[PDB]
Amino acid sequence: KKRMIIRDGVFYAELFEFLKRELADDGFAGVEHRVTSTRTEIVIRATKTREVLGEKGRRIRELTACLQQRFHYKEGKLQLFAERVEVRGLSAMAQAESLRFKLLSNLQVRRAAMGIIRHVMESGAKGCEVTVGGKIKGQRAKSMTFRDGYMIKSGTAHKNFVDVATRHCHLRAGTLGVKVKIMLPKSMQNEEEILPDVIT
Amino acid sequence: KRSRDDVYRFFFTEGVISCKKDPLGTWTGSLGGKTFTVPSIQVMQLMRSMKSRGLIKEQFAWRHFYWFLNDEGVEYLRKYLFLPHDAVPNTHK
Amino acid sequence: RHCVICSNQKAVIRKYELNVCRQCFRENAANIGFSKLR
Amino acid sequence: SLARAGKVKNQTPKVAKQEKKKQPRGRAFKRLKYTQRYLAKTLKPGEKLHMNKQPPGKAG
């Protein structure tokens, strides 16, 4: 229906926002959910799945419980799982979090960003970009670019390949902005718009 | 107020707590099934008072509040009741 | 009317197709499944 | 304005300094520095070691 799709949008929004704030620096990619008929799997994409669960088991049932108490869900209609994402490099948001941590620790912008770039471009990524605007001086609102490999912004097709993350760091004097992109070496449309090949 | 009594119970054997931020009353719970009737404002006040003592941990999304009860919070709560317990979060599972 | 994802009630409320996402603008607050292609 | 002189030096706070123990003198003084900066360190200044450093606070 009209309303179904909208309400699904709402549910995803609320869920995604709750996690992406309050559970962070675990290499959080995001979440994905699907129905199994009167139950919803709701897998949680993280690099480190141990913090998601908890070693006391409190975390996973807290996050189930918060959802239940809001939406009037009950057990056996709701569930939460963990999923191991290998290569934190290929997750925009995950790299974003680790970078944010470096900056809040009061480490150098250059050194920090170079860490992200090294990590990403090792796993075979086409390109990456780290655009950190904000304070680093005063008195500017200076913007620093770091650009690596190659990246496309052409078409609407680019949006599917390239996942993006924007986050904030909060420091003395005020806000510092952070952004990470990362063009994946593996398509999510299974499509390219360049290089006609010849099979010999 | 005698109102606050009901909410002092609401902490216990309900795990994580949830509220909506509103200036106008509405029942915070749903999951616990206790069905206390309390205005939201009062609930919020108590949540905040013992957040300031480090007992409770706050987390927030959009306009909603979700309050988790720490190890410390559990300990305190058990003493304030008198009633010893095997720790609120870990009992449920 | 009034809004449920702010309490501002000003800076304009969408109530089209039973949703509010214009007291927090939808360009910033996406993942409702909408896209622009045309 | 012929007179408004001394405006700033009226208003400012006076701690009126703070007590301190006597310092080494003669060779003893020169000793004191040569130990601090050039020994118990991996570096000699240079600007590589900074002789005075201060804590943070406020930034603009």
Added chain:
RNA sequence: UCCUUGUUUUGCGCAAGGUGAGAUUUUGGGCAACAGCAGGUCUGUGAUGCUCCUCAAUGUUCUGGGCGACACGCGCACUACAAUGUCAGUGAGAACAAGAAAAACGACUCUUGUCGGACCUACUUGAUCAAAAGAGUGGGAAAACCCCGGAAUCACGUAGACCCACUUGGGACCGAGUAUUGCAAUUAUUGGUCGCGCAACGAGGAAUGUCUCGUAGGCGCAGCUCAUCAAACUGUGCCGAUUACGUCC
């Protein structure tokens, strides 16, 4: 692509015609590099530095009332209605359109785990006597909603009426009545009656705007906002040209 076997020194290509639904960035949109601006936004935010308001708080209030809308007839920006004979002005009848909107309240009733009321439209009473407007039955979560789609531009000589006038062309002021909406109306209401029209204005100085095709122009409908009102904004459809297809002043 072919062809003109033209133009093409060979190339990159160009023009006309042809096949053809369609002749070149196929057509219309959408996205878009680098360098930036002391552009706008701290009344979008749980996005924020500091330092102001922090209780005769100014913060804050389902609190009450008022403002943002005022009127020397003052300037500017944008909009809409006209001065009519190329809907032309009051009357009647015919044929005929397309996206899109809609529903669900812990409120009642229902049971061993729970159903119908805030959306529309149909039909009939609303004329043994108006409009506005009352109410009952009936269906829909939409390719179901009664033909899913209709009345404006248009057509019409039915031998309609007016007829070259500031009128019977236009409305804007102004008074009286009533019903509808709402937590509350103080022309809020306005799809309504019926006064004033013989109040303006006759295509309107200088100046200046933007479009080469199903476009311009003309016309209507829905969505949007939401106690209630659209000359606004957004989208769909209908009627549908003149000139140019060149140059760089």
Added chain:
RNA sequence: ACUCAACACGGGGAACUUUACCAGAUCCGGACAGGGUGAGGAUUGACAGAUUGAGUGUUCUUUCUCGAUCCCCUGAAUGGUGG
């Protein structure tokens, strides 16, 4: 906001609400008791009377209903459509 990248623009067709602003009253949100008042407290709730636009229970009197959270002093604080 003010040549253009102002001026049917701030999805801004605002009457009470929205509200910055004005005319007045109110709340604790001032939480946090570490320095004080438990019973009978500065209190929660309250008919009448009064207060005042507001029989409104804020307030004050009467008398009743009282948890001792509300209340007292500092520090601390949070909230804001303020720049």
